[PDB]
Design a protein around this ligand. Structure first.
Ligand SMILES: Nc1ncnc2c1ncn2[C@@H]1O[C@H](C[C@@H](N)CC[C@H](N)C(=O)O)[C@@H](O)[C@H]1O
Ligand code: NA
Ligand code: NA
Ligand SMILES: [Zn+2]
Ligand SMILES: [Zn+2]
Lengths: 122, 297
């Protein structure tokens, strides 16, 4: 029944003033991308930074199993877009946030699926 | 002038000289370029290498196979691998390797001496950033180095598809005479210096379109002396300018033809297609790789 909870440990570590994981690999890009959360190539917009996925994954960086039956990673081999305001802690951002399964944008940082219906535009 | 280029390629005239080896003394030594905010030196370096490789006749087949040696870092991540995966088409197989453990974006990662890496398949592109830490620590007469370079020479002669290309990192002291000789087994080759690291004797030996035989006999000791003469007499201004325009960065997916021809079917017409980056010769079997594990108590 025992199971190590790395996510909780990193969050408590940050709340205690712990220094965020460093050396996340920031990529050079045009910053004119789609702004989607996790992509096959850097897609940062003007308000995001693109990073190599594996370097922003707590499980990959801590060398511990991924929390799912297949042990599959959704960041490794892809690029993660992080809001510039949160680019100082990409590992913490990917843990505390969720990608919208509909538009592919971060919930609360791009996903507009829950905004009131806009009046139709010609 | 060349400050807006990703870097500088050794002019062809240097390859035809017979220079005597001597110390590499760079005028722009100690200096450093202005790196974009939060960008690692190796992300900048690989980005400029890839920007230059875009100007060459690289074969880019569907299901391209790329292997990256010396992909690890003391940071435990793979900056160069992240750039290669950004640069290469989405359907490209990318395998990386390093002596020390690291976290990577590659499809597969092998940990251990490159001499322990085995593969039953041929590759379309070989990138190497391997560098022995003792090369700096201990000083030695500047002779040809025979550690991981002997493995790279063998890997090129047995696991590189005809039409394939390589980019092998060298420095004043980290070089190999046999590797320079193998540059003569490509349709074309050069020594490329990234503008962001122009204050270093580092260069990437680029072999473009492997022919599996020598089109030119190259004396490696003389060619490294020619390379140092170029670095000592043509100062390269440090520059990060090419890093700010990434609009044409992705390698264009040419869909280069892949054929499994016999060694007896390689005629002059085939050599001509290989030389233009219009043909890759190798089988297209299951890509299988492994790293030997030394067993002991
Ligand atoms: N014989 C060898 N086999 C495999 N890797 C080696 C060997 N000798 C040196 N290396 C590696 O070469 C690497 C040199 C580094 N500068 C590579 C940096 C890396 N390319 C990056 O993207 O940051 C080190 O990580 C070494 O462990
Ligand atoms: Na890509
Ligand atoms: Na191993
Ligand atoms: Zn992971
Ligand atoms: Zn949404």
């Amino acid at each position: 029944a025992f199971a190590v909870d790395a996510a909780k440990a990193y969050k408590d570590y940050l709340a205690s003033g712990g220094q965020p994981i460093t050396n996340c690999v920031k990529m050079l890009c045009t910053h004119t991308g789609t702004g989607q959360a996790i992509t096959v190539t850097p897609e940062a917009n003007m308000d995001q930074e693109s990073f190599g996925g594996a370097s922003c994954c707590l499980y990959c960086r801590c060398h511990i199993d991924h929390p799912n039956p297949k042990g599959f990673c959704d960041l490794k081999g892809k690029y993660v877009q992080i809001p510039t305001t949160c680019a100082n802690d990409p590992v913490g951002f990917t843990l505390k946030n969720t990608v919208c399964t509909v538009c592919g944008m971060w919930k609360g940082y791009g996903c507009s699926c829950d905004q009131l219906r806009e009046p139709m535009l010609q | 002038s060349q400050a807006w280029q990703p870097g500088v390629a050794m002019p062809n005239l240097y390859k035809m000289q017979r220079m005597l080896l001597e110390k590499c003394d760079l005028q722009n030594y100690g200096d450093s370029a202005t790196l974009p905010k939060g960008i690692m030196m190796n992300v900048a370096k690989y980005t400029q290498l890839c920007q230059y490789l875009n100007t060459l006749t690289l074969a880019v087949p569907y299901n391209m196979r790329v292997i990256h040696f010396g992909a690890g870092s003391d940071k435990g991540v793979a900056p160069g691998t992240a750039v290669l995966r950004q640069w290469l088409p989405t359907g490209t197989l990318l395998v990386d390797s390093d002596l020390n453990d690291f976290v990577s974006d590659a499809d597969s990662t092998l940990i251990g001496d490159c001499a322990t890496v085995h593969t039953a398949n041929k590759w379309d592109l070989i990138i190497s950033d391997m560098y022995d830490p003792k090369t700096k620590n201990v000083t030695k007469e500047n002779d040809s180095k025979e550690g991981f370079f002997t493995y790279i020479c063998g890997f090129i002669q047995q696991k590189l598809a005809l039409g394939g290309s390589v980019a092998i990192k060298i420095t004043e002291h980290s070089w190999n005479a046999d590797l320079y000789k193998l540059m003569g087994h490509f349709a074309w080759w050069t020594a490329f210096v990234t503008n962001v690291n122009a204050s270093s004797s580092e260069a990437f030996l680029i072999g473009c379109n492997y022919l599996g035989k020598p089109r030119e006999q190259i004396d490696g000791y003389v060619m490294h002396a020619n390379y140092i003469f170029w670095r000592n007499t043509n100062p390269i201004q440090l520059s990060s300018y090419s890093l700010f325009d990434m609009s044409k960065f992705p390698l264009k997916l040419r869909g280069t033809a892949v054929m499994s021809l016999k060694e007896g079917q390689i005629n002059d017409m085939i050599l001509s297609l290989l030389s233009k980056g219009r043909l890759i010769i190798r089988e297209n079997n299951r890509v299988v790789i492994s790293s030997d594990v030394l067993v002991n108590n």
